[PDB]
Design a protein around this nucleic acid. Sequence first.
DNA 1: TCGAGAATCCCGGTGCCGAGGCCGCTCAATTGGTCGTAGACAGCTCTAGCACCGCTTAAACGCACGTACGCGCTGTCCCCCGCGTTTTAACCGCCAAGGGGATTACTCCCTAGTCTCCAGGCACGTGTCAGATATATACATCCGA
DNA 2: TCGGATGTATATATCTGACACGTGCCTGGAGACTAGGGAGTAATCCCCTTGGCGGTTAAAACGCGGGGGACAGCGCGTACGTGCGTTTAAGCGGTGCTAGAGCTGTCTACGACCAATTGAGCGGCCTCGGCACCGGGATTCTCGA
Lengths: 98, 97, 94, 94, 109, 109, 85, 81
Amino acid sequence: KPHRYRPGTVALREIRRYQKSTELLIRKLPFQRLVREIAQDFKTDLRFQSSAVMALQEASEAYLVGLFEDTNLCAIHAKRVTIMPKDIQLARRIRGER
Amino acid sequence: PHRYRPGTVALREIRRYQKSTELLIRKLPFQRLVREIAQDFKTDLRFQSSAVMALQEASEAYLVGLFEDTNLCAIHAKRVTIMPKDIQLARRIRGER
Amino acid sequence: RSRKESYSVYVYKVLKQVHPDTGISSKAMGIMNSFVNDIFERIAGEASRLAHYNKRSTITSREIQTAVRLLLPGELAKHAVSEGTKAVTKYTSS
Amino acid sequence: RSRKESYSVYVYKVLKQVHPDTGISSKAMGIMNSFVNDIFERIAGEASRLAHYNKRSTITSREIQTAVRLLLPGELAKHAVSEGTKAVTKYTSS
Amino acid sequence: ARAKAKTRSSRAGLQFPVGRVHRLLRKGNYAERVGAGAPVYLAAVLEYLTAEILELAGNAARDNKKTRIIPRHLQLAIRNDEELNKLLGKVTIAQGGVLPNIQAVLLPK
Amino acid sequence: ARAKAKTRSSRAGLQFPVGRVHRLLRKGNYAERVGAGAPVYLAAVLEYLTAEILELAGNAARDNKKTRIIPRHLQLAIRNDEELNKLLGKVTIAQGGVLPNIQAVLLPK
Amino acid sequence: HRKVLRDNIQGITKPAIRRLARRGGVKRISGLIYEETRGVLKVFLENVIRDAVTYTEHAKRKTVTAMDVVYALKRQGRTLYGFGG
Amino acid sequence: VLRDNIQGITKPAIRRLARRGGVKRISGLIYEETRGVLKVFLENVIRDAVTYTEHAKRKTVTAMDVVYALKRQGRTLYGFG
DNA sequence: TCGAGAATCCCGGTGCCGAGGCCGCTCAATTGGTCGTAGACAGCTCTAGCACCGCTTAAACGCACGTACGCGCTGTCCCCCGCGTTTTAACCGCCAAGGGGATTACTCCCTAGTCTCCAGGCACGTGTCAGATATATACATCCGA
DNA sequence: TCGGATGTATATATCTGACACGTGCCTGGAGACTAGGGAGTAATCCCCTTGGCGGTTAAAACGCGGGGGACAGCGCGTACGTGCGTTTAAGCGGTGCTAGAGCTGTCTACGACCAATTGAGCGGCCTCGGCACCGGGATTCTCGA
């Protein structure tokens, strides 16, 4: 009979691996295209330094990871282990972003 | 006897206090508390009259805003009563702890 | 005896232009004084930092216009920019 | 070709005093450069505002000491104040 | 013979004082020198924002049958706008109160 | 005859430069004039705070068997203190990571 | 009459805390809220008053002015209108 | 020109970000909601950075422009100048 | 409570590129005088902060009752996790072109600094009307039969 | 669905103190003039940004099976809301005193400014050892019988 881990065992192993490393978790090329698309609406024919795109990516990942920390606390407060869209909305409301 | 049902007088009081603008803490007890706290940083201090008024206006505005966020947390857990755990969660997300 | 200065005279003139028949209490006049002083320091501080980034030593109307675009949101910034441009053109023509 | 300046030389001297056998990478040296510049502007800005409230036109060591008490928390402020006082006394004695 | 004096505000068509704003910029330690158009531009923007608030506050005062403007009227004007509420989002107004607002789940069936 | 030159840092017993700090204060538009003791006091405080961070970071580097200090070591030093974490509570450190932390309800029985 | 003060946090009574919560729009309050609220207020007041006394001492005065309180609140991101400035 | 680039932020990448935050179970409607939040964040920062670039009369966004924009919003970043 | 399987730790050997040190050299800090004003100190005037006393009453406190809300337990079902298979595009290395950032010279116009002069804005004084308060309704809302 | 009880909106009459407006005056803004350096413009050099191509493999996308977590429903008990009778201290008006904030006049020492002079710190090379990577075995943690 084949081997299978139970649900939630591989998930905990991945939490430990990613909380120990420091590299970026979004692919470089798709992120660069998204940044250039957004800037078109403010000005045409712009150029970016290489380090400018890196600075934007470091700030964006740090913002999202912090948001997921607060979202997790709201879900536990309601006796759950699954994060839901209403958990994200409550966190952004109290933080004053909305 | 003409007892009202539970929660009917409470809704009446929300409407009355959300329409007025006066201060809700008594003035003499608040002044004593301010003087007690300050004596730990320095002895034999005097206060201007408007200085104590400014402190009270800021303190009430801070607490009323905190109660607004606490109420949202309790509803998120399918309740209508507020509990100390609701206050703790709100202050943690706001970054005060 | 030293004498102090405020914006009460100028605020009252503006009020008589948009509502010719309404007055204002002294407590409300104090709040408007705080508002004008607060916005003045926000704009002047940002324009000061702009001149330092670009190695200039003068604050001109160009630095003021860029600071207004950074601080005011949305449609407020568009209306404020056109007011400032119109006043400078009229002042220069005379 | 213009040449720039940093705090890299001075940071390296301090490191050799608390850990005589450890080095540092270039990425970590860039982070320490940002830290020193950030703290410098926080202290200088607060001391500038202090002189304005009290109608002075000079920034002295008294304004620096009051600014450190406002910004640093707890036991960090106590240790920093004694470091600054000792350096000024030694500089004046010579 | 010297010509008749004339304020800098009158030649710009403004009500806020251009001379006083120029002096405040010079003695605030913002830069080494101040251009001639900077005070005119700044005074016009301050006057525009004052007109916006006073217009909305006067509407609120007349709404509840009053002649004068009190701090409660200023608070109602600010929190009911969308842009003004965003510009003054970290400000407390003394003797202002709050907006009436009750959550829907608290109402009786 | 002029006496031998002597740095202002050496007279105060410091490692951070007193002359450069004095120039930065003069050309930063902070006040009209700068006293003679202000640069000495400021340089000593900056040097003290640098020594605090580097000492904790070196302990972290040696903890996981390394000779040099990398950005991960600086982040571990800062977030594990109580006062340093409060002074730098709004700062992001590039290539720093996070502290390992799992909520207790998520662990298996 | 420099007689000290003690146990003044109890002057913030239960009815006063109830009025503050009604303006925030809450409907039912549990019995352990009152002790919790007193602790929160004390922490807030300590931080503001410590800064105000620091401003008073640097000016070499013995009286806390309304200007001192306004500067301390602004330094913590809680700007207040209506008391000068 | 470019279009439909928000879908380059895939579902596996969003899962890795939540794992670093310590999340164990994710519902299926999270992914579309996260993309909306990121787009709002990037619009605010990039609009400020282009304003700094124009005032200097340049055609290239520098790393210093991005650092100034982040600091204006209370989001200081170390390690880029 | 035990075996089988899969993941993770530990160790030895190889190789490379970045940290650390060394050499010119030039520009910024230091030394030595001069001078004018910002700030320290003494003296004096009068505002306002503190302490006390008697009294009227609105608010705080304590007690009894009952209802509705919080919480624990059960059952079901469908959504989300773990895993194997195929498909796609990210990444790397290497060319090649030129758009634009960065530096240097030159010149002139805009801003600071003085001095005279006069009108705008501040402190004070005064009278009346907008708003606060008491009373007597008129009507809308809640609750049990 | 309806009547009784309670709370609240509305209209009338009366007072009072704060707002709005004169009046005198003084100091800050405006007019006219001069001198110097900050910034605008042209020219030039070279770096670093953009675009393209081909190969390799790691990651993304898809489908499927089933375990467990979310959610609805039910029952019970206790804690919190409502209301009444008694007790406490806040608010108010009015005296009285002196501590200290605020203003004014002298006078000196300290910080700006300028001109020589030289050594500290920056840019540009070299070079070797700390760390990255691969492969093989040991140890541990999970899962079912």
